[PDB]
Write a protein that binds this ligand. Sequence first.
Ligand SMILES: Cc1cc2nc3c(=O)[nH]c(=O)nc-3n(C[C@H](O)[C@H](O)[C@H](O)COP(=O)(O)OP(=O)(O)OC[C@H]3O[C@@H](n4cnc5c(N)ncnc54)[C@H](O)[C@@H]3O)c2cc1C
Ligand SMILES: Cc1cc2nc3c(=O)[nH]c(=O)nc-3n(C[C@H](O)[C@H](O)[C@H](O)COP(=O)(O)OP(=O)(O)OC[C@H]3O[C@@H](n4cnc5c(N)ncnc54)[C@H](O)[C@@H]3O)c2cc1C
Lengths: 401, 401
Amino acid sequence: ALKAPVVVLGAGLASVSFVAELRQAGYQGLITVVGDEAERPYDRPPLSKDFMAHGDAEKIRLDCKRAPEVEWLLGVTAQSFDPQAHTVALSDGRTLPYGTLVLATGAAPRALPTLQGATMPVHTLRTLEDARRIQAGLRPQSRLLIVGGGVIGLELAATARTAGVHVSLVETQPRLMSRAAPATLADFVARYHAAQGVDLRFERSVTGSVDGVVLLDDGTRIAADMVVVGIGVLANDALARAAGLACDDGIFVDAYGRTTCPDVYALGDVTRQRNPLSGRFERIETWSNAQNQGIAVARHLVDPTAPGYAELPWYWSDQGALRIQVAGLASGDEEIVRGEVSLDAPKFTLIELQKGRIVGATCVNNARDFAPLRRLLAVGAKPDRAALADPATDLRKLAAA
Amino acid sequence: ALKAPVVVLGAGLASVSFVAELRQAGYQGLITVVGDEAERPYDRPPLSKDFMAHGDAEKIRLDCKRAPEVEWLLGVTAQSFDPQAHTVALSDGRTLPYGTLVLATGAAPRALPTLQGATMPVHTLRTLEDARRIQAGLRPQSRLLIVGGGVIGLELAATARTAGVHVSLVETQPRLMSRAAPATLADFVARYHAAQGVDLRFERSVTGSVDGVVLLDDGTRIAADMVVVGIGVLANDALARAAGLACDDGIFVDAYGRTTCPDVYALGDVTRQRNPLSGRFERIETWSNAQNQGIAVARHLVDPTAPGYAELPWYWSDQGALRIQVAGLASGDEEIVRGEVSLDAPKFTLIELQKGRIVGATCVNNARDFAPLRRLLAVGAKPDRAALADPATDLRKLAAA
Ligand SMILES: Cc1cc2nc3c(=O)[nH]c(=O)nc-3n(C[C@H](O)[C@H](O)[C@H](O)COP(=O)(O)OP(=O)(O)OC[C@H]3O[C@@H](n4cnc5c(N)ncnc54)[C@H](O)[C@@H]3O)c2cc1C
Ligand SMILES: Cc1cc2nc3c(=O)[nH]c(=O)nc-3n(C[C@H](O)[C@H](O)[C@H](O)COP(=O)(O)OP(=O)(O)OC[C@H]3O[C@@H](n4cnc5c(N)ncnc54)[C@H](O)[C@@H]3O)c2cc1C
């Protein structure tokens, strides 16, 4: 159960949601949060979206007032922990004792070795600092090269195009968002960005760079004023690895957030956990997971009577005129398409089925359907394939089941 | 003497210089610094200068590595202290014990009540946050109104003009930098800014504002997209006042940084101290004072054998093409002018005399002379009035004496 004092490593969304929930649940004991970034806790989603526009960090801070009497050690790095002695060594020379240790260290952007020593600016996008630097280079008429067709790269592509920047995007895979989205969506998104002026290149890899020019594996080249690398992230599990916990690009935890080390828990982007829909363990790198997992784990720690974490995964993406919401699995037995997939008036819904059962849903500029669909997904609904296809009200079908 | 542990309130230049000096001097005990700003300690001078151009805060951070093993509580506010119990109450619910308490809380910009409720943005310039907000409004062709003809307002005037902003400056006094500079300099500076396109208005006061228009006490009005108020600062001495120390818009301290409360010291912008040149007590709001006073006080705390703080005051200002350096008093018996005071090629030196004794010096785009002049000032030199006037080498005269 809960043993005081509580020490949380990392001051991101997972950590903030966890501590707030502890207090809300009733834990009145000591809570200390260690965050290496010298910044008032903030939200990351805005960084590749609205923030690139207003540059106002005060519009993206997280609400830490819901977590009364918590000491936040900002600008401090947890260098290591001793599971035997139950202590944490900090970069400022101090040591913190703990009853319960929570690792919410997130993940960090993977680097591109071929660009080691590029004569032009090469950035990754994870922190407020990264965002400020990138935002500064988004001048009109400049040439931006984005390596990686994931949601964050595409959101930045859309943002940059709006600022009058010329954007080129290189992806090793034959499609965009190859990991997190259904093929139908990836095809439409590619078409949308192409139509926006984005120079997309699939199945191309960066091999190197010479005098301000990026070289591709197909013997061609691309001159860029700035390069932004977004080819995925790696779990910040170094402390857990050194302390002997089970890790493989992420700390393994069960539904209670427990690691293989007693009194040590983990939450957020840094964890490999069971995907309830696929039954497999994976790292779920979403905003809702960081928040929901932090809450679920805090609740069970205060009350073992509470159930383990069981929320289904979902995320959203804002890419220019596209408001994308994706829940569950990207593929299944069959796919139902509601509405029309038109570049002109994009507004459709995709439903992924697995033997009559809803296992996934995508909504593009159709938020009204997302809520019900998530409910249907939650109960493993198996609705009428026909009713599902023809313009029925999901809110209604959802209500029934 | 020095009693552990040391607790410093405020994480500005004074605090950083003090703690670094403590460690350098040999104090190996505990040191805790409390700073209400959630920012890695940074320098303020760049904010109204270069920073407005590059917006890169990483180019202005202070070096805290010279102060090993210091715990920096950033984003935390010291709410009060108990000189009896020797404790400090923090905003996060924690309490810190202290052997020696140092107040380095600086000062805060004074507000303009007549602009309370202005329909347009009204900012003051003190922090990195203020700087980022102001920098965002510096768009070309916009109209900026600056209230206050002090160095910071003038530095911002120069900066804004360079960004193609239309600048209007209102000052209640008949001259610029009325407090810190010799009249000869203030006249030249006014002429320089006027020639740069700055709309200067002297002996004018702001009486109010209506629908995006600032009203002056002379029945006239000025439409402005943004207003920046820089009419001086007030010492952040609230904690000292509440604890019973002697204060009057600043904490009174002697040459050892001692306040009237045992075991409590104060440094920087927050202190009222003796001006060695005038013999009067005043608040010295300069960069060199924050650094030099912090050092002098740390030294004497570790070694009572060391002398009290005795540096003479000086500061600089970068206003467009003008590199201004001012040391000592702004006025005296007579003034010697070396070089030519031309708007075209500004490069002159002013020497303030008091019965044959050098009591002040101003250098405009003449840094070579500043060093020697400061040395002459340090020894209270009384050189030849003629030699001083005619092109002699100050380095040389300085060497002699
Ligand atoms: C630009 C961007 C846009 C995104 N947009 C979306 C979106 O639209 N929708 C969505 O669902 N998700 C989005 N995400 C993902 C979402 O931001 C993450 O899932 C979420 O931030 C993960 O939270 P976290 O608390 O686990 O970890 P993080 O936010 O990474 O925070 C972990 C913190 O711990 C710190 N830390 C690491 N090691 C140490 C140590 N040893 N000592 C002290 N501190 C340490 C880290 O530096 C960091 O500040 C986006 C992410 C980025 C970067
Ligand atoms: C825009 C600008 C430009 C300048 N340019 C020049 C220049 O060119 N040349 C020059 O000589 N001088 C210049 N100065 C003046 C110089 O910056 C100051 O003299 C110097 O910063 C004073 O240092 P300080 O450490 O005393 O206090 P400060 O820097 O004010 O820092 C005190 C710190 O304590 C914090 N604090 C206050 N109360 C509390 C509390 N209760 N708990 C915790 N923390 C608290 C404050 O918020 C602040 O961060 C400039 C100042 C500004 C604002």
